[PDB]
Write a protein that binds this DNA or RNA. Structure first.
Length: 50
DNA sequence: TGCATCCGTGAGTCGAGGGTAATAAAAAAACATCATGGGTTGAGTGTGGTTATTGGGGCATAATCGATCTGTA
């Protein structure tokens, strides 16, 4: 009753959360220092960490 | 003296894949350096050339058979 079964979906979602934390670490500065009008969301995100 | 605190320890052969990745700026000048290309050394490998021959065949100069008409009891 005190032990829990963690299956593949759970660790997959945990790793995805880590990837999104990595993304936010750069988006926090990208929004603060970047352009306000011509900035498209595509060019300011990075798919390598996830 | 009692307290927390830190520091080593803890098997053995074996196999199969075996490597993955958060990010970043451009100019200019200045200099170093290798890369190729063309030209002297030079270093070969290449190729004919005269002169030492030693078996072989040869012509001389000798030699040992093979066949028939004149001399002796």
């Amino acid at each position: 009753g005190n032990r829990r079964i963690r299956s593949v979906g759970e660790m997959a979602e945990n790793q995805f959360r880590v990837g999104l934390v990595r993304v936010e670490r750069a988006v926090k500065e990208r929004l603060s220092l970047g352009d306000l009008d011509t900035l498209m969301p595509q060019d300011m995100i990075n798919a390598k960490p996830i």
